[PDB]
């Protein structure tokens, strides 16, 4: 939670409307230091005491986490009026709508290096012992390098069957939302079981349906996905596992085919 002056920061447009505000892009100039972009979120115009507290403690977790696939916080402005949180900008956006806006334009290793680089910082938010809950390619952003970087600190079709029948949320059940994202990434921001209903949704998996492969995606890549979607939630690879499969898939580019 490092605090930043006000007067150091210049907020140009706005880039969204989040839940509990407005996102914009701006400029962060730090005395004797280079001037780099940065996300400034707002608190919704008229915000109480209680709505700030939440805020800042949003804040404070994101301080503790320091690694190249978890959004960074750069820092808080709460000595001034409005409070405001700033992260660092991720210019391509949230992964869902990039894809969306690029089909087909990436190619398969490509796409792979970018799973690889979520999966890490998933491996490393369970060493850290906090469930996401909410893992989908929406919540992840993407810089201008094409690094991807977990955010977003019951959506039912990201969701594992225990996490929606039992509410037992585990990073197990975000390995379940992994391979859902991994299917997202591989159809370029496909819907996840395209217009079947929620319950639909939930009826299909309790029947042992999965989604089939997206077009062009490496078997080997699907067969991931299928293990991320077991049944039994301990049979399901832990993210360390993923990430060194992706790592051997990259190393190993015939294993694509
Ligand atoms: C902290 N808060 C400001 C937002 C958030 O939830 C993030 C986080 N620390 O988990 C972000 O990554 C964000 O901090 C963040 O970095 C955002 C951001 O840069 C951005 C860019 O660059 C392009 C498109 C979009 Cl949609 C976004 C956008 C709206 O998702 C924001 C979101 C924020």
């Given at each position: 939670?490092?605090?930043?002056?006000?007067?150091?920061?210049?907020?140009?447009?706005?880039?969204?409307?989040?839940?509990?505000?407005?996102?914009?892009?701006?400029?962060?100039?730090?005395?004797?230091?280079?001037?780099?972009?940065?996300?400034?979120?707002?608190?919704?115009?008229?915000?109480?005491?209680?709505?700030?507290?939440?805020?800042?403690?949003?804040?404070?977790?994101?301080?503790?986490?320091?690694?190249?696939?978890?959004?960074?916080?750069?820092?808080?402005?709460?000595?001034?009026?409005?409070?405001?949180?700033?992260?660092?900008?991720?210019?391509?956006?949230?992964?869902?709508?990039?894809?969306?806006?690029?089909?087909?334009?990436?190619?398969?290793?490509?796409l792979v290096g970018m799973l690889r680089g979520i999966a890490?910082?998933?491996?490393?938010?369970?060493?850290?012992?906090?469930?996401?809950?909410?893992?989908?390619?929406?919540?992840?952003?993407?810089?201008?390098?094409?690094?991807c970087?977990?955010?977003?600190?019951?959506?039912?079709?990201?969701?594992?069957?225990?996490?929606?029948?039992?509410?037992?949320?585990?990073?197990?059940?975000?390995?379940?939302?992994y391979?859902?994202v991994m299917?997202?990434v591989m159809?370029?921001?496909?819907?996840?079981?395209?217009?079947?209903?929620?319950?639909?949704?939930?009826?299909?998996?309790?029947?042992?349906?999965?989604?089939?492969?997206?077009?062009?995606?490496?078997?080997?890549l699907?067969?991931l996905?299928?293990?991320?979607?077991?049944?039994?939630?301990?049979?399901?690879?832990?993210?360390?596992?993923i990430?060194?499969?992706l790592?051997?898939m990259?190393?190993?580019?015939?294993?694509?085919?």
């Amino acid at each position: 939670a490092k605090e930043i002056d006000v007067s150091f920061v210049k907020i140009e447009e706005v880039i969204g409307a989040g839940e509990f505000g407005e996102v914009y892009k701006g400029r962060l100039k730090l005395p004797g230091k280079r001037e780099i972009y940065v996300a400034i979120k707002t608190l919704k115009a008229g915000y109480s005491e209680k709505q700030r507290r939440d805020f800042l403690s949003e804040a404070s977790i994101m301080g503790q986490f320091d690694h190249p696939n978890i959004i960074r916080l750069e820092g808080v402005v709460t000595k001034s009026r409005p409070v405001m949180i700033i992260t660092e900008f991720m210019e391509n956006g949230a992964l869902d709508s990039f894809l969306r806006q690029n089909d087909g334009q990436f190619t398969v290793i490509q796409l792979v290096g970018m799973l690889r680089g979520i999966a890490a910082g998933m491996k490393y938010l369970a060493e850290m012992n906090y469930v996401h809950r909410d893992l989908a390619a929406r919540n992840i952003l993407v810089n201008s390098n094409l690094v991807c970087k977990v955010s977003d600190f019951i959506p039912v079709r990201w969701t594992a069957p225990e996490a929606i029948a039992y509410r037992k949320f585990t990073s197990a059940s975000d390995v379940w939302s992994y391979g859902i994202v991994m299917w997202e990434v591989m159809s370029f921001g496909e819907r996840p079981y395209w217009d079947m209903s929620n319950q639909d949704v939930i009826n299909a998996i309790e029947q042992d349906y999965r989604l089939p492969p997206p077009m062009d995606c490496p078997a080997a890549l699907h067969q991931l996905m299928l293990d991320c979607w077991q049944k039994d939630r301990n049979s399901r690879p832990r993210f360390a596992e993923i990430v060194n499969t992706l790592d051997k898939m990259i190393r190993n580019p015939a294993s694509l085919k």
